[model samples]
Target chain A: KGLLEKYNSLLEFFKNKKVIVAYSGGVDSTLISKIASDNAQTLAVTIDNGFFSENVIKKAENRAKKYNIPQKTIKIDYLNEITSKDLENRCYNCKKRIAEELKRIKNELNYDIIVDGTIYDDIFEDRPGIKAFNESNIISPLSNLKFSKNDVFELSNYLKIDIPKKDTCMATRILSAPISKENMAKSNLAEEFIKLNFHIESYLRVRYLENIAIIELTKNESEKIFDNDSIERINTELKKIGFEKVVLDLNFKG
Target chain B: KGLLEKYNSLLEFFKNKKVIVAYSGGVDSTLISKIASDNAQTLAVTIDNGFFSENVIKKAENRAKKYNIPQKTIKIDYLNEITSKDLENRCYNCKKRIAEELKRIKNELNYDIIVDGTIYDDIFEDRPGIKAFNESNIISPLSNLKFSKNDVFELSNYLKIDIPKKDTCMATRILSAPISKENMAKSNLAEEFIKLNFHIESYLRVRYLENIAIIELTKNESEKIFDNDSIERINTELKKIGFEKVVLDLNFKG
Candidate 1:
């Protein structure tokens, strides 16, 4: 009862202050968007960096429309600053720049709190963006309340927010590969091609480095991807990204 | 010619000084041991810790006997000092302690220098042990000569050292599991037991962590180790050391 009261008080606290949520259209962010919109002045901001999934833009648009919260999508020009020599710290510098862009939007909107959907699962683990967020004074309601990812999904459904559960990110597919805007654009296109031709099962990463486009997919997904004209489509799409060879590796331990 | 003269001059600089070599029976140390034996007043000290494979003791003994260099094998009291909590700086501390022991032995033998087989290849992007060697004032003759692994092998052949082509430690199989000297001893024994049935075609580090024994076999050697009889024999031996599961990792870039 006491914990519920505390949570309720937080909701009540946000009832007046205008919030611009950095929504990703994921369950956690959808729940935050719903809550922020219900209680107070709220807007959802999604960035189209040519890095995340094409589905993400649609999902975010749908989520904001359903929530009846004002939403904006900004396309980031990440390619201008990215260079071939930038490898490990590329994510760090990129996050800093992206966070700065978001900060500028927050200031323009005159919103006191810039909200994000970061939850408990991502708390302990190291993510480069979390450092950028700390400097930006970004409000993380789910993380602040110590809500697990599962809790966010449960609560979002309980509250009747129609948030589609889908996983599609081009960057995660490449693991620790350097982020080149050029490469990211190619990676996003590959992901879209995969999603269109085949049903994504579990997790997949069409890792394209140099001439090799190493296709890492689960058994079910790989079976689907290799069927019909899928192989031809994969080959063509991978070739556009400068890959001379497209190999399906089913032996990935991940 | 320039590099060789530079190396020869460096070797000549330490001409009169006696040195101690930490012999690990690997190709790096084997080449270093051979060079130190041929070049200066050298003591080839092999610390008989249980972290190494069972055949290491025999190999080191044979190499020392072949060259007529005095070899010392001291059974370490690992359980007393090496515990699970000491995992952070386990390598550095162990090397420092071993270096200290070598210093004591060198003082007894009236040797003035300490040499190791840290080659150019061992100077990978990141290694903490290099710092320890620096602090201890131990000389890395192979690294000073700017020798790579291939260079070391070539030098071994040139010197007619009779060094085995398969020169890698069997301790690396157990990735980063919290290990004790007692556990390492058991793991080494298990490795030796497996070697009895197989030629150990390539370098292998059969590691037992908790109830699982991870076998890190270099490159294509896993195919041979997977032979029915060999696998059964290896599994049975590891079972004695309390390993409930066997995992074979054949993907070593080396």
Candidate 2:
């Protein structure tokens, strides 16, 4: 209800702040990327951890290019410990590595501060890499301005930003196996095939493990997967893409 | 409509037939094994072609032991050609090898004929190894007596036999990957955990691939898996059971 006052003042916080927006090409970050670019000196930095598929990386780069946002992709391999095993605090450690990289980028590029896509409802310390977001002089103006998740979408639409919802890190898809680049690539490809062939819009993920592609869709969209000969067709296509089997999640929610 | 007459005729046909019954510990074969033991000089032969779990084999043996039926287990490794690669008509080839082995057994034991558990409904040449069953002098008294699938279950009930429905071979679970013992064992263990933890009644299978356990439950029972904390519980349990991930089939049918 009080969106305009806070959204109007986001640029006020950005004034005089030469910033690096932590960009993932999702709606939340795109808002920060566009808003920060308009009001401050901004460099959109994308982290190339071993998890994101090449296609996902390319999409992010393409979107940044389309917006004329100055962007650079940094590949980070120092976080193998996070992806190579069943680390309990994996997300925490991953965020720490990301923070370290972002800090180095900020210093090297002479940026005054780093801004992340964290929002208001993500106040919980254990969530959304908040613990690490607090470090490296990183700030979340969106959160400070009280942008709930609803506010994020509303703002994205309000600003005419074309972006899908943020995808969780691919490392989160594998439960106990190492989040290797090969598995992530395979999952990404299978998901691409499924979405293309089935004409899926969004809110779907293909999880890879032991040569199986397990597809998960949000509750409203999951039923569409079983339409026609969709399961068998997707099964055959996924197998051709190197998965030994394909499964659908019966109880998936956003 | 005529189960008793067909059931009565089964033993009469078994008379004077020194037979080797292809026993798989399922209801239909258990019926044949029991009746053949009483009316014919019978020996039940169970095939271990890198598919059946140790538990499955042991269950078969234990049942035979309880019934005081003569049972022998044969381990065959020559089917690696089928299990170690993606072979079209794999079941057909596997059945041909089984026929060859059973022929050898019948000749070695001086048996007059080999009996299989195929019923009347499975008469199509492409189905149920009918092409291979035609070879090796393998006689299916169940098929010969017009024993439909219904007849098999009704006879099982009539004879008071405690047996589950026929279990498909594990090799069939893998679509493109080699059907290795390692993967099958992992699938079996993971499935055992799911069934035990959830108290699954039956009609469930855990398909293994790469490092994922994809669970398929018959339509009636699929919804039971989502009971409070069950998905998360099963996910954690399957990880402990050596699967890197777990998935549920949303369109599984009996």
Candidate 3:
């Protein structure tokens, strides 16, 4: 019941204090990007990492333009530098690298503060990267305002913020191993594997571990993975990428 | 109707396959350790890494003893040679090392197949060690079986296997930065800071990214972070330990 008043006050807070949104093209940042338009001294800085779908940078740019918010994009190759390890701690390294870069940008550009689109529900400090963000002094107002992913999506829809059809990372397609141009190429194929085969709106993971390449789709989407020449196609493609075997995760029964 | 038959067939497949069950005292591994007992030629191997809790080795030994399965517990710090930078590709190198050690034992004992207690719910593929297993040809039968976290817990209960409760890495509470012996000592102190202020369960991550120590806790936990005396005590201690500033995530925000 009190959420509405708190939510409204959040918008008011931005209006009063001004904001610089570290907007991603995803749902959360996009909402922040929209709100920044009406806030004083508002700007948006979009970081262009290679771990995203094909037109993410352009999408963020377009959103900024549509919202009439001042925006900037920084392209960095931390993905290339960080490809040699698996996910867990690499997350910490990646976030630290991004923060270091962002700090320079913040100081040089004269932005009073850097804000992220992290919501309250996303507030699991289990990842080392989340810790890095705080250490770097990158502020997350959404988390402070107690906006959860569900809350952000609901409010984004309510505010008519045009978010993309999906939110994901290129890393999701990758199973552990270093980030390399080779692995990334293989990773892209896995993404293509999901796209060409399953058109459903869901998160998919290709568990390209040593002996097997296990594809993880949502429980409801698992059947489609085994349907109509899908197995053969995946075998051929993943085999080309050096996996000796492939299997679908059927236990994820929705 | 058909799914049950397929499940039975998979169970038969496990029965037929010559499996070497890799048992570490963890729940996921323990479940596989138990289930694979019904499979052909199963064995459990436990390694005592220096970093793990003191009781882990003892519990693993006890579990193996109770199960009456062929068990081997090796005491070694393969990580001794590993420097901080070596931790960069940590999982990859570490897993490869462990796999090598496991392989040596398997060869000595005349085991055909090597198995680990890998579960589907685990972030195994995305973690460092997947690369090691893939390279070494260590099979993850559980992942192939693809049990969700819920399934694993339920099955464990059904099998009367005493599953280990979830245990977080105590080191995780330490901030991710250049970890040294000195800072590690300080991190121990940081744990006290979490207890005195944010409650005992709260794991305070004081992320020391070179200069600043960024404190992170759960959103709900943030409110309890600072009290009049606790704040002053924390600030003074943290400063002495090389942290120039301390900031609480007051909103229970990460």
Best by the TM-score measure: 2
In model 1, the clashing pairs are none
Give one digit per residue, the lDDT tens place, for model 1 in A36-91. 88888887888776667566687788778877877888887764444434555555
Which regions of candidate 2 are displaced past 4 Å? A1-254, B1-12, B66-68, B78-83, B124-128, B153-160, B163-168
User: Highest lDDT, which number?
Assistant: 2
Q: A124-195 in candidate 3: lDDT tens per residue?
A: 747566788789887777888877777887888887776586656666455556555555567567766667
Question: In candidate 2, what are the lDDT values of residues A99-122, reduced to their tens digit?
Answer: 889998888888788899888877
- TM-score of only chain B in every candidate structure: 0.75, 0.83, 0.76
Q: Which candidate, 1 or 3, has the higher DockQ?
A: 1
Ranking under DockQ, best-scoring first?
Answer: 2, 1, 3
Worst 10 residues of 1 chain A by lDDT: A245-254
**Ten-residue region with minimum lDDT total, candidate 2 chain A:** A219-228
Sorted by lDDT (best first), the order is: 2, 1, 3
DockQ of each: 0.02, 0.21, 0.01
